[PDB]
Amino acid sequence: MQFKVYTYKRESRYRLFVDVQSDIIDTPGRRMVIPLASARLLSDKVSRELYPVVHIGDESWRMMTTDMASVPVSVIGEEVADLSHRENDIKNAINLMFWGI
Amino acid sequence: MQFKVYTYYRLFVDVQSDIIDTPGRRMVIPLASARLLSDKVSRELYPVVHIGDESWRMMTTDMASVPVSVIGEEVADLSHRENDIKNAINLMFWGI
Amino acid sequence: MQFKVYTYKRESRYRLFVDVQSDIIDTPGRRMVIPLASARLLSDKVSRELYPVVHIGDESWRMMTTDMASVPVSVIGEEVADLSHRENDIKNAINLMFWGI
Amino acid sequence: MQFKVYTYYRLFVDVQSDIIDTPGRRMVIPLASARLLSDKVSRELYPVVHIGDESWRMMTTDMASVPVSVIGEEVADLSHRENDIKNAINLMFWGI
Amino acid sequence: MQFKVYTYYRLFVDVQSDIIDTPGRRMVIPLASARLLSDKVSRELYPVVHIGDESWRMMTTDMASVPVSVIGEEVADLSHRENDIKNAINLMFWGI
Amino acid sequence: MQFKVYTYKRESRYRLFVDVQSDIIDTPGRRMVIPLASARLLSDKVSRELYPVVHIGDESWRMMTTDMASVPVSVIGEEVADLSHRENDIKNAINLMFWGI
Amino acid sequence: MQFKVYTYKRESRYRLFVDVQSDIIDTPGRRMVIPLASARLLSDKVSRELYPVVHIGDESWRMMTTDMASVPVSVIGEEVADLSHRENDIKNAINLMFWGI
Amino acid sequence: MQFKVYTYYRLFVDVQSDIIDTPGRRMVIPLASARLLSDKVSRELYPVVHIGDESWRMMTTDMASVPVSVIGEEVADLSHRENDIKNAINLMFWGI
Ligand SMILES: [Cl-]
Ligand SMILES: [Cl-]
Ligand SMILES: [Cl-]
Ligand SMILES: [Cl-]
Ligand SMILES: [Cl-]
């Protein structure tokens, strides 16, 4: 579901990621997701517009927008958080990456 | 064993006949959380099953041959859903 | 398309595979396929009911029914042959693997 | 570069903005032989494009981030289809 | 962050500058248990560091670019070993 | 060998890369390499200090310094070119990535 | 270290493996190892001396000699046991696989 | 077939006994271009062999079990080097 954060049930690649695909579009075998990385791993210089900073619990995470990928629904784990309140920032990040707007 | 769900916490249903014994691989259909697919997705092709209190969708179109050495513990039995599973598989291959 | 044999555009132990999914069922991102292997690689003691032998050119190939897999359409190459005339054998192989008898 | 088709799982359309340099990767949409999908499959979500005399479907839902080091030679330019490509992507993310 | 040790219980040291944001990856050097290598192996090229009560060897020649999304929790800080790490890296590239 | 550009035997990840490891340091099973990418894939706004632009034949390539990796010698293909004349730029790129302040 | 049994840090595979490389030979990035599998009666044609049975705790394990592989030292876990007392059997298994006339 | 060289340009030498064949796997030692290793690298452990003009190093320490289904065409025969290959393998396991 869009704006929900899930865990990955596989080996490497990611730990956490945000589902950014519309809830009316069923692939249905996959979902478009944006992986999250520990905010401490990126400096303050890195654009918060392309790579928004979100809070899951008490920790800060960066949305690695440019590492967006299609992931099979069978590997999507448990729902960890909801980032619906950040809809505007997420939308801007995605629109910026594709349309430079 | 046919219609049993196993782990390797990823889930999959064994859909191969119990008579096909020699092959070192079992045909399985992966399960996905039902909340991940809308109700508009065909229940004929992607049946919805229950394991515990949760709902899962059978990702019929992601069927795959998996080595028996990676098949984990038996989590549930879906024998009572034999008819739905059979229809899903027959629809994907011959389906009308 | 069902019963058509195609080349694989990925790194695989197999160079040819047969599309066995219905033409009325669009996933649409994947197709159910059965890989082909050189017949010389399997002894005659291996069931011809479950592993049909087909011909493409001057070579004999075995259908590795038990290695059936869902493959993305983007990796399906050029059409090499048509096995429509073997529909009955292919159907029996698939029905045997799932429903036995 | 945006709307350009490149080779390597053989054909991909670069759909990332030219103003956004990752710079190690690019967002791409894989192409599949149009003959592999029936006409009943939405052209809004999966546009049909022509490279040479052959027809290809844009597998929008299989979009992925790909390292620039694996992007091959430029095969074609789909700038004239900008509107269709834009609609496909916007539909997948914001569709109502 | 440079000179910090992270989890993958696999361990590796971030050796990339903090002023250089890829930003999707980080250059890291994997750590291996010191008991696995004899004392005859160069400590100049493969420095020995301590994390807790265990000794680890820096597998400098196995250095690799790793995506930030797979970097786990910070386990230790090896800033005090900056000189040894710097020498190991400079030796591998420039023959010191 | 240092400053030499080679091809990659496997079909994945790389196509061409530059060996940047010292010739006096034998791993000996691996070599530190920097992958090359078509220069047209990156805009001119991308730092030439960190990502040098080199020429191999008539084509321009960018050195993807931040994607540096250890690669087994068994997968290193044929020698395509020599970039010894660019030693200073390559050295600066590497030193900047590790020791930049 | 030779004849020591370790736990793995990577995915898939077995669970335990025996280091069979000489202690005087430092690669130093890899170690030759033989994976262990839960003891079971084999059907593998000739030789049961090709797959020695060893004990770790109260359990029995078979040395899958033919699945020997080079493994990076960074993925070798904690030392679980020592099979130095079985040196002769291990040596014979390895010599049989390579030179077994 | 022991002492021979097969592919999948890639190159590897089959070093398993011809007596042992039941597993669908063969022990192989990968070959690397001799130019990739300096002359200071032991020829006892990493023998140098020739195949159609070029020189190759046997990467003894990268020995691995490979499935027979992925072994390609026979490119050469190194039976005449049996003694060197045997010594390399014995050295790696028994220290000379
Ligand atoms: Cl139910
Ligand atoms: Cl896939
Ligand atoms: Cl067109
Ligand atoms: Cl220390
Ligand atoms: Cl130049």
PDB file of all heavy atoms in Angstrom, chain F residues 1 6 9-10 23 26 28-29 31 73-76, chain H residues 9-10 30-32 35-38 41 46 56 59:
ATOM      1  N   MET F   1      46.988  -5.340 -14.804  1.00  0.00           N
ATOM      2  CA  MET F   1      48.086  -4.336 -14.693  1.00  0.00           C
ATOM      3  C   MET F   1      47.519  -2.939 -14.524  1.00  0.00           C
ATOM      4  O   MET F   1      46.544  -2.570 -15.180  1.00  0.00           O
ATOM      5  CB  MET F   1      48.988  -4.396 -15.924  1.00  0.00           C
ATOM      6  CG  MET F   1      49.929  -5.605 -15.916  1.00  0.00           C
ATOM      7  SD  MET F   1      50.997  -5.668 -17.362  1.00  0.00           S
ATOM      8  CE  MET F   1      51.957  -4.171 -17.137  1.00  0.00           C
ATOM      9  N   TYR F   6      40.293  -3.157 -19.299  1.00  0.00           N
ATOM     10  CA  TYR F   6      39.940  -4.506 -19.718  1.00  0.00           C
ATOM     11  C   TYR F   6      38.437  -4.669 -19.884  1.00  0.00           C
ATOM     12  O   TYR F   6      37.653  -3.834 -19.425  1.00  0.00           O
ATOM     13  CB  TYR F   6      40.408  -5.536 -18.681  1.00  0.00           C
ATOM     14  CG  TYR F   6      41.886  -5.525 -18.351  1.00  0.00           C
ATOM     15  CD1 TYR F   6      42.357  -4.868 -17.216  1.00  0.00           C
ATOM     16  CD2 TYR F   6      42.811  -6.202 -19.150  1.00  0.00           C
ATOM     17  CE1 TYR F   6      43.709  -4.884 -16.884  1.00  0.00           C
ATOM     18  CE2 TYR F   6      44.173  -6.224 -18.826  1.00  0.00           C
ATOM     19  CZ  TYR F   6      44.613  -5.564 -17.690  1.00  0.00           C
ATOM     20  OH  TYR F   6      45.951  -5.580 -17.342  1.00  0.00           O
ATOM     21  N   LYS F   9      34.294 -10.492 -18.593  1.00  0.00           N
ATOM     22  CA  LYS F   9      33.811 -11.745 -19.173  1.00  0.00           C
ATOM     23  C   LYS F   9      32.325 -12.028 -18.925  1.00  0.00           C
ATOM     24  O   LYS F   9      31.619 -12.445 -19.846  1.00  0.00           O
ATOM     25  CB  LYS F   9      34.673 -12.924 -18.714  1.00  0.00           C
ATOM     26  CG  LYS F   9      36.030 -12.976 -19.392  1.00  0.00           C
ATOM     27  CD  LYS F   9      36.948 -14.001 -18.745  1.00  0.00           C
ATOM     28  CE  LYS F   9      38.330 -13.958 -19.374  1.00  0.00           C
ATOM     29  NZ  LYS F   9      39.314 -14.829 -18.674  1.00  0.00           N
ATOM     30  N   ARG F  10      31.843 -11.809 -17.701  1.00  0.00           N
ATOM     31  CA  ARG F  10      30.424 -12.037 -17.406  1.00  0.00           C
ATOM     32  C   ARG F  10      29.578 -10.995 -18.146  1.00  0.00           C
ATOM     33  O   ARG F  10      30.107  -9.983 -18.626  1.00  0.00           O
ATOM     34  CB  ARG F  10      30.141 -11.965 -15.898  1.00  0.00           C
ATOM     35  CG  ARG F  10      30.962 -12.920 -15.036  1.00  0.00           C
ATOM     36  CD  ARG F  10      30.268 -13.234 -13.709  1.00  0.00           C
ATOM     37  NE  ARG F  10      29.421 -14.428 -13.802  1.00  0.00           N
ATOM     38  CZ  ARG F  10      28.122 -14.431 -14.106  1.00  0.00           C
ATOM     39  NH1 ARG F  10      27.477 -13.293 -14.353  1.00  0.00           N
ATOM     40  NH2 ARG F  10      27.465 -15.584 -14.175  1.00  0.00           N
ATOM     41  N   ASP F  23      51.080  -2.585  -9.252  1.00  0.00           N
ATOM     42  CA  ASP F  23      51.633  -3.771  -9.895  1.00  0.00           C
ATOM     43  C   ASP F  23      52.552  -4.545  -8.969  1.00  0.00           C
ATOM     44  O   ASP F  23      52.942  -5.674  -9.266  1.00  0.00           O
ATOM     45  CB  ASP F  23      52.360  -3.400 -11.188  1.00  0.00           C
ATOM     46  CG  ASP F  23      51.389  -3.118 -12.336  1.00  0.00           C
ATOM     47  OD1 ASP F  23      50.230  -3.586 -12.262  1.00  0.00           O
ATOM     48  OD2 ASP F  23      51.764  -2.429 -13.311  1.00  0.00           O
ATOM     49  N   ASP F  26      50.276  -8.126  -5.282  1.00  0.00           N
ATOM     50  CA  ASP F  26      49.536  -9.257  -5.837  1.00  0.00           C
ATOM     51  C   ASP F  26      48.633  -9.782  -4.738  1.00  0.00           C
ATOM     52  O   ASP F  26      49.101 -10.157  -3.662  1.00  0.00           O
ATOM     53  CB  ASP F  26      50.479 -10.370  -6.292  1.00  0.00           C
ATOM     54  CG  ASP F  26      51.286  -9.982  -7.503  1.00  0.00           C
ATOM     55  OD1 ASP F  26      50.702  -9.917  -8.608  1.00  0.00           O
ATOM     56  OD2 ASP F  26      52.501  -9.743  -7.339  1.00  0.00           O
ATOM     57  N   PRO F  28      46.683 -12.659  -4.669  1.00  0.00           N
ATOM     58  CA  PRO F  28      46.761 -12.428  -6.116  1.00  0.00           C
ATOM     59  C   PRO F  28      45.485 -12.792  -6.874  1.00  0.00           C
ATOM     60  O   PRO F  28      45.448 -12.694  -8.100  1.00  0.00           O
ATOM     61  CB  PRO F  28      47.892 -13.362  -6.527  1.00  0.00           C
ATOM     62  CG  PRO F  28      47.591 -14.573  -5.708  1.00  0.00           C
ATOM     63  CD  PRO F  28      47.210 -14.002  -4.342  1.00  0.00           C
ATOM     64  N   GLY F  29      44.449 -13.218  -6.155  1.00  0.00           N
ATOM     65  CA  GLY F  29      43.213 -13.627  -6.806  1.00  0.00           C
ATOM     66  C   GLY F  29      42.290 -12.540  -7.316  1.00  0.00           C
ATOM     67  O   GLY F  29      41.339 -12.834  -8.050  1.00  0.00           O
ATOM     68  N   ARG F  31      41.839  -7.945  -8.309  1.00  0.00           N
ATOM     69  CA  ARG F  31      42.428  -6.667  -8.709  1.00  0.00           C
ATOM     70  C   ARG F  31      41.391  -5.570  -8.443  1.00  0.00           C
ATOM     71  O   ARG F  31      40.195  -5.784  -8.657  1.00  0.00           O
ATOM     72  CB  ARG F  31      42.786  -6.661 -10.204  1.00  0.00           C
ATOM     73  CG  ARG F  31      43.871  -7.656 -10.662  1.00  0.00           C
ATOM     74  CD  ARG F  31      45.280  -7.336 -10.137  1.00  0.00           C
ATOM     75  NE  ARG F  31      45.847  -6.124 -10.729  1.00  0.00           N
ATOM     76  CZ  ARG F  31      46.932  -5.495 -10.276  1.00  0.00           C
ATOM     77  NH1 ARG F  31      47.582  -5.964  -9.217  1.00  0.00           N
ATOM     78  NH2 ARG F  31      47.347  -4.377 -10.859  1.00  0.00           N
ATOM     79  N   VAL F  73      40.599 -12.115 -10.778  1.00  0.00           N
ATOM     80  CA  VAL F  73      41.411 -12.105 -11.994  1.00  0.00           C
ATOM     81  C   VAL F  73      40.911 -13.047 -13.088  1.00  0.00           C
ATOM     82  O   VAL F  73      41.161 -12.819 -14.277  1.00  0.00           O
ATOM     83  CB  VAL F  73      42.899 -12.405 -11.691  1.00  0.00           C
ATOM     84  CG1 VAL F  73      43.494 -11.298 -10.829  1.00  0.00           C
ATOM     85  CG2 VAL F  73      43.033 -13.730 -10.977  1.00  0.00           C
ATOM     86  N   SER F  74      40.181 -14.085 -12.692  1.00  0.00           N
ATOM     87  CA  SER F  74      39.664 -15.056 -13.647  1.00  0.00           C
ATOM     88  C   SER F  74      38.570 -14.507 -14.553  1.00  0.00           C
ATOM     89  O   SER F  74      38.252 -15.105 -15.582  1.00  0.00           O
ATOM     90  CB  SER F  74      39.169 -16.316 -12.923  1.00  0.00           C
ATOM     91  OG  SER F  74      38.241 -16.014 -11.891  1.00  0.00           O
ATOM     92  N   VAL F  75      38.006 -13.363 -14.182  1.00  0.00           N
ATOM     93  CA  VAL F  75      36.936 -12.759 -14.972  1.00  0.00           C
ATOM     94  C   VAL F  75      37.406 -11.548 -15.777  1.00  0.00           C
ATOM     95  O   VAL F  75      36.616 -10.926 -16.488  1.00  0.00           O
ATOM     96  CB  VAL F  75      35.740 -12.347 -14.076  1.00  0.00           C
ATOM     97  CG1 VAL F  75      34.499 -12.105 -14.906  1.00  0.00           C
ATOM     98  CG2 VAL F  75      35.481 -13.395 -13.016  1.00  0.00           C
ATOM     99  N   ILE F  76      38.688 -11.208 -15.653  1.00  0.00           N
ATOM    100  CA  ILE F  76      39.259 -10.080 -16.389  1.00  0.00           C
ATOM    101  C   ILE F  76      39.589 -10.526 -17.816  1.00  0.00           C
ATOM    102  O   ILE F  76      40.336 -11.490 -18.018  1.00  0.00           O
ATOM    103  CB  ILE F  76      40.512  -9.526 -15.675  1.00  0.00           C
ATOM    104  CG1 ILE F  76      40.117  -9.035 -14.273  1.00  0.00           C
ATOM    105  CG2 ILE F  76      41.119  -8.390 -16.483  1.00  0.00           C
ATOM    106  CD1 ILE F  76      41.263  -8.600 -13.380  1.00  0.00           C
TER     107      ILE F  76
ATOM    108  N   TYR H   9      36.996 -18.467 -23.671  1.00  0.00           N
ATOM    109  CA  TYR H   9      37.380 -17.192 -23.073  1.00  0.00           C
ATOM    110  C   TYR H   9      37.448 -17.197 -21.534  1.00  0.00           C
ATOM    111  O   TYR H   9      38.382 -16.629 -20.958  1.00  0.00           O
ATOM    112  CB  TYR H   9      36.457 -16.072 -23.568  1.00  0.00           C
ATOM    113  CG  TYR H   9      34.983 -16.296 -23.299  1.00  0.00           C
ATOM    114  CD1 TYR H   9      34.328 -15.596 -22.282  1.00  0.00           C
ATOM    115  CD2 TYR H   9      34.239 -17.195 -24.068  1.00  0.00           C
ATOM    116  CE1 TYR H   9      32.970 -15.784 -22.036  1.00  0.00           C
ATOM    117  CE2 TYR H   9      32.878 -17.390 -23.831  1.00  0.00           C
ATOM    118  CZ  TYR H   9      32.250 -16.681 -22.813  1.00  0.00           C
ATOM    119  OH  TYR H   9      30.905 -16.867 -22.574  1.00  0.00           O
ATOM    120  N   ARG H  10      36.478 -17.843 -20.879  1.00  0.00           N
ATOM    121  CA  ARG H  10      36.418 -17.931 -19.408  1.00  0.00           C
ATOM    122  C   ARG H  10      37.541 -18.818 -18.827  1.00  0.00           C
ATOM    123  O   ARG H  10      38.351 -18.356 -18.012  1.00  0.00           O
ATOM    124  CB  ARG H  10      35.043 -18.454 -18.972  1.00  0.00           C
ATOM    125  CG  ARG H  10      34.770 -18.378 -17.472  1.00  0.00           C
ATOM    126  CD  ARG H  10      34.552 -16.950 -16.981  1.00  0.00           C
ATOM    127  NE  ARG H  10      34.212 -16.922 -15.558  1.00  0.00           N
ATOM    128  CZ  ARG H  10      32.975 -17.025 -15.072  1.00  0.00           C
ATOM    129  NH1 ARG H  10      31.935 -17.159 -15.890  1.00  0.00           N
ATOM    130  NH2 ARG H  10      32.779 -17.021 -13.757  1.00  0.00           N
ATOM    131  N   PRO H  30      40.002 -22.475 -11.834  1.00  0.00           N
ATOM    132  CA  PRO H  30      39.896 -21.433 -12.863  1.00  0.00           C
ATOM    133  C   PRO H  30      41.251 -20.924 -13.367  1.00  0.00           C
ATOM    134  O   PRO H  30      42.256 -20.933 -12.642  1.00  0.00           O
ATOM    135  CB  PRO H  30      39.097 -20.333 -12.159  1.00  0.00           C
ATOM    136  CG  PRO H  30      39.437 -20.534 -10.697  1.00  0.00           C
ATOM    137  CD  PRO H  30      39.422 -22.028 -10.550  1.00  0.00           C
ATOM    138  N   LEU H  31      41.275 -20.531 -14.637  1.00  0.00           N
ATOM    139  CA  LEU H  31      42.479 -19.996 -15.254  1.00  0.00           C
ATOM    140  C   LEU H  31      42.321 -18.483 -15.399  1.00  0.00           C
ATOM    141  O   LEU H  31      41.214 -17.978 -15.609  1.00  0.00           O
ATOM    142  CB  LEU H  31      42.691 -20.616 -16.640  1.00  0.00           C
ATOM    143  CG  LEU H  31      42.896 -22.130 -16.711  1.00  0.00           C
ATOM    144  CD1 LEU H  31      43.109 -22.522 -18.146  1.00  0.00           C
ATOM    145  CD2 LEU H  31      44.095 -22.540 -15.864  1.00  0.00           C
ATOM    146  N   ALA H  32      43.429 -17.765 -15.257  1.00  0.00           N
ATOM    147  CA  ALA H  32      43.432 -16.314 -15.397  1.00  0.00           C
ATOM    148  C   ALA H  32      44.595 -15.956 -16.315  1.00  0.00           C
ATOM    149  O   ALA H  32      45.581 -16.698 -16.403  1.00  0.00           O
ATOM    150  CB  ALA H  32      43.611 -15.655 -14.045  1.00  0.00           C
ATOM    151  N   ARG H  35      49.252 -12.373 -17.571  1.00  0.00           N
ATOM    152  CA  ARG H  35      49.645 -10.969 -17.495  1.00  0.00           C
ATOM    153  C   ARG H  35      49.070 -10.276 -16.250  1.00  0.00           C
ATOM    154  O   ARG H  35      49.605  -9.260 -15.795  1.00  0.00           O
ATOM    155  CB  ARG H  35      49.197 -10.215 -18.758  1.00  0.00           C
ATOM    156  CG  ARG H  35      49.813 -10.694 -20.076  1.00  0.00           C
ATOM    157  CD  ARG H  35      49.226 -12.026 -20.562  1.00  0.00           C
ATOM    158  NE  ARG H  35      49.887 -12.509 -21.778  1.00  0.00           N
ATOM    159  CZ  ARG H  35      49.349 -13.364 -22.650  1.00  0.00           C
ATOM    160  NH1 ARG H  35      48.123 -13.847 -22.457  1.00  0.00           N
ATOM    161  NH2 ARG H  35      50.042 -13.736 -23.723  1.00  0.00           N
ATOM    162  N   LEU H  36      47.993 -10.837 -15.700  1.00  0.00           N
ATOM    163  CA  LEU H  36      47.330 -10.290 -14.515  1.00  0.00           C
ATOM    164  C   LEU H  36      48.062 -10.527 -13.188  1.00  0.00           C
ATOM    165  O   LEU H  36      47.705  -9.938 -12.166  1.00  0.00           O
ATOM    166  CB  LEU H  36      45.903 -10.830 -14.424  1.00  0.00           C
ATOM    167  CG  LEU H  36      44.769 -10.117 -15.170  1.00  0.00           C
ATOM    168  CD1 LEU H  36      45.287  -9.202 -16.273  1.00  0.00           C
ATOM    169  CD2 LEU H  36      43.808 -11.166 -15.721  1.00  0.00           C
ATOM    170  N   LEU H  37      49.045 -11.429 -13.196  1.00  0.00           N
ATOM    171  CA  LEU H  37      49.845 -11.736 -12.005  1.00  0.00           C
ATOM    172  C   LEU H  37      51.316 -11.503 -12.320  1.00  0.00           C
ATOM    173  O   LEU H  37      51.778 -11.832 -13.415  1.00  0.00           O
ATOM    174  CB  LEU H  37      49.666 -13.190 -11.564  1.00  0.00           C
ATOM    175  CG  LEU H  37      48.403 -13.620 -10.825  1.00  0.00           C
ATOM    176  CD1 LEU H  37      47.272 -13.877 -11.823  1.00  0.00           C
ATOM    177  CD2 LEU H  37      48.713 -14.894 -10.038  1.00  0.00           C
ATOM    178  N   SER H  38      52.053 -10.937 -11.370  1.00  0.00           N
ATOM    179  CA  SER H  38      53.476 -10.680 -11.585  1.00  0.00           C
ATOM    180  C   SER H  38      54.277 -11.979 -11.468  1.00  0.00           C
ATOM    181  O   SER H  38      53.767 -12.994 -10.984  1.00  0.00           O
ATOM    182  CB  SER H  38      54.006  -9.646 -10.590  1.00  0.00           C
ATOM    183  OG  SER H  38      54.164 -10.216  -9.306  1.00  0.00           O
ATOM    184  N   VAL H  41      54.801 -14.102  -8.116  1.00  0.00           N
ATOM    185  CA  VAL H  41      53.798 -15.048  -7.609  1.00  0.00           C
ATOM    186  C   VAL H  41      54.266 -16.481  -7.898  1.00  0.00           C
ATOM    187  O   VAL H  41      54.537 -16.834  -9.054  1.00  0.00           O
ATOM    188  CB  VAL H  41      52.400 -14.816  -8.265  1.00  0.00           C
ATOM    189  CG1 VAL H  41      51.379 -15.801  -7.723  1.00  0.00           C
ATOM    190  CG2 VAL H  41      51.919 -13.386  -8.020  1.00  0.00           C
ATOM    191  N   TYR H  46      50.760 -21.547  -8.167  1.00  0.00           N
ATOM    192  CA  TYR H  46      49.983 -21.055  -9.307  1.00  0.00           C
ATOM    193  C   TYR H  46      50.744 -21.326 -10.600  1.00  0.00           C
ATOM    194  O   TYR H  46      51.366 -20.426 -11.166  1.00  0.00           O
ATOM    195  CB  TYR H  46      49.714 -19.552  -9.176  1.00  0.00           C
ATOM    196  CG  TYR H  46      48.976 -19.170  -7.915  1.00  0.00           C
ATOM    197  CD1 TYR H  46      49.672 -18.683  -6.816  1.00  0.00           C
ATOM    198  CD2 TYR H  46      47.588 -19.309  -7.815  1.00  0.00           C
ATOM    199  CE1 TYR H  46      49.020 -18.344  -5.647  1.00  0.00           C
ATOM    200  CE2 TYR H  46      46.915 -18.970  -6.641  1.00  0.00           C
ATOM    201  CZ  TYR H  46      47.645 -18.487  -5.560  1.00  0.00           C
ATOM    202  OH  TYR H  46      47.034 -18.153  -4.372  1.00  0.00           O
ATOM    203  N   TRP H  56      48.513 -18.656 -19.268  1.00  0.00           N
ATOM    204  CA  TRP H  56      47.484 -18.596 -18.240  1.00  0.00           C
ATOM    205  C   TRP H  56      48.023 -19.088 -16.907  1.00  0.00           C
ATOM    206  O   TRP H  56      48.908 -19.945 -16.865  1.00  0.00           O
ATOM    207  CB  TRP H  56      46.306 -19.473 -18.641  1.00  0.00           C
ATOM    208  CG  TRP H  56      45.699 -19.080 -19.945  1.00  0.00           C
ATOM    209  CD1 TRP H  56      46.102 -19.464 -21.197  1.00  0.00           C
ATOM    210  CD2 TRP H  56      44.551 -18.249 -20.130  1.00  0.00           C
ATOM    211  NE1 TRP H  56      45.265 -18.928 -22.151  1.00  0.00           N
ATOM    212  CE2 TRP H  56      44.303 -18.175 -21.522  1.00  0.00           C
ATOM    213  CE3 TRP H  56      43.698 -17.559 -19.252  1.00  0.00           C
ATOM    214  CZ2 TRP H  56      43.238 -17.440 -22.059  1.00  0.00           C
ATOM    215  CZ3 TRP H  56      42.637 -16.826 -19.784  1.00  0.00           C
ATOM    216  CH2 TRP H  56      42.418 -16.774 -21.175  1.00  0.00           C
ATOM    217  N   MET H  59      44.584 -20.564 -11.020  1.00  0.00           N
ATOM    218  CA  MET H  59      44.222 -19.960  -9.741  1.00  0.00           C
ATOM    219  C   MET H  59      43.803 -21.049  -8.761  1.00  0.00           C
ATOM    220  O   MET H  59      42.638 -21.165  -8.383  1.00  0.00           O
ATOM    221  CB  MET H  59      43.116 -18.918  -9.936  1.00  0.00           C
ATOM    222  CG  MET H  59      43.450 -17.827 -10.957  1.00  0.00           C
ATOM    223  SD  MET H  59      45.087 -17.058 -10.758  1.00  0.00           S
ATOM    224  CE  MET H  59      45.106 -16.651  -8.995  1.00  0.00           C
TER     225      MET H  59
END
